[PDB]
Ligand binder design. Structure first.
Ligand SMILES: *[C@@H]1O[C@H](CO)[C@@H](O[C@@H]2O[C@H](CO)[C@@H](O[C@@H]3O[C@H](CO)[C@@H](O)[C@H](O)[C@@H]3O)[C@H](O)[C@H]2NC(C)=O)[C@H](O)[C@H]1NC(C)=O
Ligand SMILES: *[C@@H]1O[C@H](CO)[C@@H](O[C@@H]2O[C@H](CO)[C@@H](O[C@@H]3O[C@H](CO)[C@@H](O)[C@H](O)[C@@H]3O)[C@H](O)[C@H]2NC(C)=O)[C@H](O)[C@H]1NC(C)=O
Ligand code: FOL
Ligand SMILES: *[C@@H]1O[C@H](CO)[C@@H](O[C@@H]2O[C@H](CO)[C@@H](O)[C@H](O)[C@H]2NC(C)=O)[C@H](O)[C@H]1NC(C)=O
Ligand code: EIC
Ligand code: NAG
Ligand code: NAG
Ligand code: NAG
Ligand code: NAG
Ligand code: NAG
Ligand code: NAG
Ligand code: NAG
Ligand code: NAG
Ligand code: NAG
Ligand code: NAG
Ligand code: NAG
Lengths: 324, 409, 278, 186, 48, 49
């Protein structure tokens, strides 16, 4: 699994620090001009993420694809990668088996009226929608999957070919180093081994699989970042209360200045920590996006002639599946 | 913070719901007698008096009309708060002590008063009030100061190690009884308390003045705990952000008719962060609470046409009405969208593959140059289809023309 | 586990701080016995004074509907079903010895006497001073051994007055309970705001411990005893165990109806410390 | 940000040390200078952390720049996607204010025509079997048995010679030609 | 030389902040809840 | 750097909690221990980043 996109979050600094109280807002504009800088940095991060998403999906785009390649095979069963939405059955399996909560768009606020989904509208942050719908990403993935019929072959992406999957696999193994006699002798055992490998791959989404745990850990890390942002509004930071209203009710003006000042300092520290974490995750996402482009253009759009890349063993064929 | 801005789908500030009403409950709590402070004789510092008041109301204007405050020392509260806000319980420790020795009750003092007679506790909010009951008020009431007033200058065991007084505790009964038994002052004298010997000290004082004024010290400890705030001063809608005051707990939130949770005896239901997520009331009905949430607002602006549009992110447009008075003084053009419904946009079926104003999930905002944007989808350009032949021949798509394309990075 | 005061929760885990007892703490065991020959049969309970500390919690009953040993008859043919008895408790600040005989447990000055009066239907918390009564072979004589709150089988204050003098008596508070044969919890703490009592006969059918009867007692309680209790006639009764509260961290969980079902000692072993750490 | 953050009072009465020294007493001066010190040290720490993060980003981009120079510029790349879009032809380097500016020249096709092809050709009688290299064997438009060679990246039907075909081991999926053999098979 | 592994360090947050003083520990738990997040993040980096 | 920030007073009278508890009263102890806590938490957060 390659984590190519960070979670895009916009935080309203005024609402997060002061929660609408005018005395806090006066104290915060006396404190400094932090909120505009926070908003500008956190908007630049999201703009860079959108540009990285477009640059990633240009590489998945192919000039030609074969829509009937995955269904017109020999003894190979590639029903896990058929476009029937264009989301494949393995994409459905992967997205169903991961414990990911639904990000509400269109009606999230209404549902929150009547966790971390409903914590957005009470804390001050908002998780932005991704640049592409899951349906369009499924079209890109299906078009890439249909284009691996003859992409590895003598047509080096300038032209397209329409070999069936059996002939393409036969050419792959030969160039690997298996002689044609051996491949012609075994035209049923090889297909059976490939089919049972894909079956164990289908069944293998458990807690033992390392890549599925990587997907789950990425989702959990995003949830932990949002929970850390949301749970620091309950900290007193050395004050009598974590609420501005209780401070305004109980104390006089001179002491209210000190208590609101320490609350403001703690919440600005939380915002700065979140922004720096988003910057570090953005650099990690840029590296992983470059790796994703290299592995698509080396493993999926061709056959790798180099060892240790495109998995263990010696590479035959690769497929790509959208992740959360 | 600038006036020449660029294009982009920015994120604007949240707009918070206002108040649509007021709700009040009090459970009709009776006045608790604070006249016990001025009823009997004024207490000795060694034998000082403590009362705890719960489930009552008090009229502070009558109480402060009987005394003249010389100086009040409050920590974590103010006397304005104790005349306005409610709290869980009230503790009053009162004793007679003259103003000439009020520095002994100051924090950090090395006098015998703090370490043997009254050790104030500062873990909870407190106010130490030095007031004087005048002679005319003293005769109007039955308040007198005719006792023999003395404090404890020594409370020592047979070990010879002093026995200090812990914060927020009354005086040890052995040293208290030994000091109040002796009628004359003595710095060191033996005392056998019920089988154990004690060496004690007695030093006298006089709180009465020449005018007859009895000088008093009142230590007030308002306790702010979770749940109902049943000690209040005598002061004179479903689905909406409304102001409340259920049991002296004041704030704002959204009220719903809700299925009962928790124990009905404990009125307030809390979360893990000290937030009230519901309450039980009279007539057996339960309401679960939530703070009134805010609409997230995004602004779409284009520099070339100087036209701005406003995206309300992930909101259903029905709900805009209820909070329609919380936005700016200009906010209609109603239109549902997959990234949250938006104002200022016309729905079009046009598709453009490359757009500079992305609204989210495969959505764009086409520039006007009308005076408004156009809602256009992202275009997925279909690749050229190549058909698989089921024979020994196979289809190829070979280029016939080309151009030298320049990419730069 | 003492319930949080003034509030409730539902399906939440909270790390509460307060007065909690240790895990696997074998508390002190006390049993009451029936009359042996027509005279009270009691134990060493009256002459031993324990330490109040930060407060105590009592597992009340918890052994009913089992086969019980009459203390005067160890033969298993005489064994019968245990009944439920409520203890008589005595809390004070200064403890010495009665003058005439030199027997411990005198309990000078004011003291809180918790008595289960009537046929186990009212619990009485009366706060005043016990002085010896100059009577023959009684408290304040040469032929005194111990005092018994002797009762019949279907007000112990009259027996207490038969063994002590009731003077300077500040309040006498009565609380209504039902006669049952069940597990119950009873707990007493003391703070600046007074003496707080806890019981399990509040709300619906749980082992939790809710506050009631905030008594106006502000002098520090330092000692407690269990006043021996006997019932005139074979019979068998349950036991109660007393555990001491400590200032420790303690992680609990609630349910749907707002009752604590399970808790964590937070310091019993390394695993509970790690559970509190995360 | 580094320059403008010095103007923040950070909760003090002023953002200048001299005004605080002029107005307040020594005990208050300690508090105000302490909160200004805390704010400015926080600013310096934030700048140093930003510098470290951009340093790791620059290390990654320097590795990428080395790889792209040694692949795109000193040689001609055969791995698609890397060295730009399309199939790489030639690349140049241009200095930039904070890095390097690459210009990749790529072969981008415009038109496409569908064609039928064969894995190879065999002669019934001699079982000699040839396969095309760097191209395909496409059918002729005026005969059902005439085969021509075409390039992979461009379309032009050419006669089959020895220089654009290789001799390979026979396969069952090759076309078994009978008449009008090409000169390598003739 | 390629730096392929970091120095794995575990820090006890409560001991480092307060050095075993009970008053400091009360003030720290009144301050907020930071030590659990520090331990979780600093254990996650070691696991990775 | 992690070890050397336990000797910083951060504006308090001392870098040791015991000296603060020995010298000052309770209300000043809260302030001094709070600023020491803030400094040490800042050091821990810098180390984790
Ligand atoms: C707290 O206690 C004070 C008493 O010290 C209350 O003040 C009293 O308020 C009543 C009602 O307003 C006053 O009665 C009025 O008297 C005039 C004639 O003087 C009469 O014309 C009116 O119809 C009314 O009966 C009373 O004079 C006044 N006394 C003083 C000394 O101020 C105060 O109202 C109490 N606070 C609350 C919230 O109840
Ligand atoms: C000794 O036996 C008696 C009688 O069997 C036990 O009293 C019974 O205790 C159970 C506790 O589970 C009570 O059940 C409760 O019933 C209510 C509905 O009334 C239900 O909502 C609760 O969840 C719970 O199941 C039962 O009512 C009660 N019997 C009577 C007559 O009150 C006693 O617990 C036994 N003692 C020991 C130590 O085993
Ligand atoms: N007259 C009389 N009074 C009694 O109290 C009495 N008690 C018993 C039996 N009492 C008991 C008490 C504890 C355990 C016991 O084994 N305790 C468990 C507790 C397990 C847990 O903590 O959940 C243990 O093994 O520790 C057994 C019998 C029998 N006859 C009696 N007879
Ligand atoms: C300390 O003050 C209390 C309160 O006045 C005294 O308690 C009173 O004692 C007298 C005489 O025994 C009783 O008549 C009153 O009813 C008691 N009142 C209350 C409220 O308890 C107590 O005696 C004083 N202590 C000493 C040693 O003199
Ligand atoms: C005669 C007193 C002044 C001279 C002191 C000389 C040396 C003692 C040095 C330090 C002890 C000072 C404590 C004084 C306490 C007074 C404040 C109070 O607790 O009320
Ligand atoms: C291919 O695999 C899918 C999923 O394992 C299965 O449902 C289907 O029956 C298989 N088809 C064949 C022909 O084996
Ligand atoms: C906007 O137009 C498209 C195409 O005409 C249509 O599918 C969609 O339902 C329209 N939006 C709404 C809210 O009706
Ligand atoms: C109790 O809380 C848990 C949270 O882990 C939840 O799954 C469960 O549904 C809750 N019970 C009820 C009755 O709501
Ligand atoms: C009985 O109590 C006395 C207290 O006077 C004590 O000394 C003795 O050890 C006790 N004996 C037993 C067996 O508990
Ligand atoms: C009690 O003790 C005293 C002194 O120790 C002694 O004189 C007296 O006789 C004792 N009383 C009895 C009953 O033993
Ligand atoms: C305790 O009792 C003794 C004698 O019984 C008495 O002198 C003393 O005053 C009492 N103490 C209190 C605080 O009442
Ligand atoms: C028990 O009842 C008998 C008969 O009424 C009575 O004489 C005796 O005093 C009673 N004893 C007690 C302890 O109640
Ligand atoms: C307690 O019960 C008695 C019956 O013995 C009754 O007379 C009394 O009114 C009850 N008190 C309360 C407060 O319910
Ligand atoms: C105890 O019961 C016996 C048996 O009837 C009786 O003789 C005796 O008087 C009773 N004693 C008391 C004090 O009730
Ligand atoms: C191109 O495709 C069409 C439709 O499938 C087919 O009739 C035609 O023969 C193809 N061209 C060649 C050269 O085979
Ligand atoms: C070509 O001839 C071979 C026999 O040498 C045969 O196995 C193969 O099927 C033939 N392929 C055709 C007819 O294209």
């Amino acid at each position: 699994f390659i984590e190519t996109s960070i979670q895009k979050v916009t935080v309203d600094c005024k609402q997060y620090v002061c929660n609408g109280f005018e005395r806090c807002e006066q104290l915060l504009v006396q404190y400094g001009q932090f909120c505009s800088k926070i908003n500008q940095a956190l908007h630049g991060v999201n703009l860079r993420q959108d540009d990285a998403t477009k640059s990633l999906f240009e590489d998945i785009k192919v000039p030609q694809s074969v829509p009937l390649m995955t269904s017109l095979t020999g003894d190979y069963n590639l029903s896990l990668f058929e476009a029937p939405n264009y989301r494949s059955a393995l994409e459905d399996l992967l997205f169903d088996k991961v414990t990911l909560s639904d990000p509400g768009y269109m009606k999230g606020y209404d549902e929150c009226m009547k966790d971390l989904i409903c914590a957005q509208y009470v804390s001050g942050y908002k998780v932005l929608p991704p640049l592409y719908d899951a349906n369009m990403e499924a079209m890109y993935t299906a078009s890439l999957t249909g284009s691996i019929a003859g992409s590895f072959w003598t047509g080096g992406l300038s032209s397209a070919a329409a070999l069936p999957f059996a002939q393409s696999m036969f050419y792959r193994m030969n160039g690997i180093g298996i002689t044609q006699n051996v491949l012609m002798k075994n035209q049923r055992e090889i297909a059976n081994k490939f089919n049972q490998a894909l079956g164990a791959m289908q069944t293998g989404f458990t807690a033992t699989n390392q890549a599925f745990q990587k997907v789950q850990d990425v989702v959990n890390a995003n949830a932990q970042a949002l929970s850390k942002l949301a749970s620091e509004l309950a900290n007193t930071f050395g004050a009598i209360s974590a609420s501005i209203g209780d401070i305004l009710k109980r104390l006089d003006v001179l002491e209210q200045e000190v208590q609101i000042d320490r609350l403001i300092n703690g919440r600005l520290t939380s915002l700065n920590a979140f922004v720096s974490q988003q910057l570090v995750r953005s650099e990690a996402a840029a590296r992983s996006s470059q790796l994703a482009k290299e592995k698509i253009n080396e493993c999926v759009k061709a056959q790798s002639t180099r060892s240790g890349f495109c998995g263990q063993g010696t590479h035959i064929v690769s497929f790509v599946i959208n992740a959360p | 913070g600038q006036f020449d801005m660029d294009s982009g789908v920015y994120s604007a500030s949240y707009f918070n719901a206002r108040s649509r009403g007021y709700y009040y409950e009090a459970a009709e709590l009776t006045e608790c007698d604070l006249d016990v402070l001025f009823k009997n004789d004024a207490p000795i510092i060694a034998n000082y008096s403590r009362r705890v008041f719960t489930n009552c109301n008090y009229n502070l204007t009558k109480l402060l009309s009987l005394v003249q405050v010389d100086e009040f020392v409050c920590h974590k509260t103010t006397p304005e708060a104790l005349a306005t806000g409610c709290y869980s319980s009230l503790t009053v420790d009162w004793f007679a002590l003259p103003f000439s020795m009020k520095s002994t009750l100051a924090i950090g003092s090395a006098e015998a008063i703090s370490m043997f007679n009254y050790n104030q506790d500062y873990s909870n909010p407190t106010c130490r009030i030095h007031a004087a009951v005048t002679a005319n008020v003293s005769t109007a009431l039955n308040f007198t100061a005719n006792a023999n007033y003395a404090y404890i200058s020594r409370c020592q065991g047979v070990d010879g190690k002093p026995i200090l007084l812990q914060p927020g505790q009354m005086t040890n009964i052995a040293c208290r009884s030994g000091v109040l038994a002796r009628p004359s002052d003595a710095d060191y004298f033996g005392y056998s308390f019920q089988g154990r010997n004690y060496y004690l000290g007695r030093k006298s004082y006089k709180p009465k003045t020449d005018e007859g004024d009895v000088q008093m010290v009142y230590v007030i400890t308002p306790k702010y705990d979770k749940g109902p705030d049943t000690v209040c001063p005598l002061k004179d809608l479903l689905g909406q952000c409304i102001d409340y005051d259920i049991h002296g707990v004041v704030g704002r939130g959204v009220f719903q008719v809700c299925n009962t949770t928790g124990i009905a005896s404990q009125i307030f239901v809390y979360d893990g962060f000290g937030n009230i997520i519901g309450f039980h009331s009279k007539n057996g009905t339960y309401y679960c609470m939530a703070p009134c949430v805010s609409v997230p607002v995004s602004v779409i602006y284009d520099k070339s046409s100087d036209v701005h549009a406003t995206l309300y992110s992930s909101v259903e447009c029905n709900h805009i009405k209820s909070v329609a008075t919380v936005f700016s003084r200009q906010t209609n053009g109603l239109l549902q969208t997959a990234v949250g419904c938006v104002i200022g946009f016309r729905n079009t079926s046009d598709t453009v593959e490359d757009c500079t104003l992305p609204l989210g999930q495969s959505l764009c905002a086409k520039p006007p140059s009308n005076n408004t944007f156009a809602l256009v989808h992202m275009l997925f350009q279909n690749p050229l289809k190549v058909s698989v032949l089921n024979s020994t021949e196979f289809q190829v798509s070979i280029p016939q023309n080309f151009s030298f394309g320049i990419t730069e990075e | 586990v003492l319930y949080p005061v003034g509030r409730t929760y539902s399906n939440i885990t909270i790390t509460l701080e307060g007065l909690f007892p240790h895990q696997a703490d074998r508390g002190d065991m006390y049993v009451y016995s029936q009359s042996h020959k027509g005279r009270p049969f009691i134990s060493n309970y009256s002459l031993v004074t324990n330490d109040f500390g930060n407060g105590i919690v009592i597992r009340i009953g918890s052994a009913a509907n089992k086969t019980g040993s009459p203390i005067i008859s160890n033969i298993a043919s005489n064994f019968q079903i245990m009944k439920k008895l409520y203890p008589a408790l005595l809390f004070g600040s200064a403890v010495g010895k009665f003058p005439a005989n030199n027997k411990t447990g005198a309990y000078f000055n004011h003291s809180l006497v918790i008595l289960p009066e009537k046929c186990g239907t009212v619990i009485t918390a009366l706060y005043c001073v016990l002085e010896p009564k100059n009577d023959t072979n009684c408290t304040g004589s040469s032929g005194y051994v111990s005092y018994v709150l002797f009762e019949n089988f279907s007000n112990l204050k009259n027996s207490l007055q038969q063994w002590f003098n009731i003077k300077d008596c500040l309040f006498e508070k009565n609380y209504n309970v039902t006669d049952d044969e069940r597990e119950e919890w009873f707990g007493i703490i003391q703070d600046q705001q007074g003496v707080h009592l806890y019981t399990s006969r509040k709300n619906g059918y749980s082992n939790n411990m809710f506050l009631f009867a905030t008594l106006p007692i502000y002098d520090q309680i330092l000692y407690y005893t269990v006043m021996p209790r006997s019932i005139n006639a074979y019979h068998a009764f349950s036991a109660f165990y007393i555990y001491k509260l400590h200032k420790i961290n303690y992680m609990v969980d609630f349910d749907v109806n707002g009752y604590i079902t399970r808790a964590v000692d937070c310091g019993y072993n390394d695993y509970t410390q790690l559970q509190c750490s995360y | 940000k580094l320059a403008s953050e010095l103007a923040n009072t950070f909760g003090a009465i002023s953002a200048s040390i001299g005004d605080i020294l002029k107005r307040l007493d020594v005990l208050e001066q300690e508090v105000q200078i302490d909160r200004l010190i805390n704010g400015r040290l926080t600013s310096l720490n934030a700048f140093v952390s930003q510098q470290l993060v951009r340093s790791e980003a620059a290390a990654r981009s320097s590795q990428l720049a080395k790889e792209k120079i040694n692949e795109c510029v000193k040689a001609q790349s055969t791995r698609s996607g890397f060295c730009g879009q399309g199939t790489h032809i030639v690349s140049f380097v241009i200095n930039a204010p904070n890095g390097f500016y690459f210009i990749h020249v790529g072969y981008h096709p415009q038109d496409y025509v569908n064609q039928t092809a064969a894995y190879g050709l065999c002669d019934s009688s001699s079982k000699k079997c040839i396969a095309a290299k760097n191209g395909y064997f496409v059918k002729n438009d005026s005969d059902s048995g005439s085969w021509s060679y075409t390039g992979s990246s461009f379309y032009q039907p050419e006669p089959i010679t020895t220089f654009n075909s290789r001799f390979v081991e026979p396969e069952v999926t090759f076309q078994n030609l009978s008449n009008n053999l090409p000169p390598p098979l003739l």
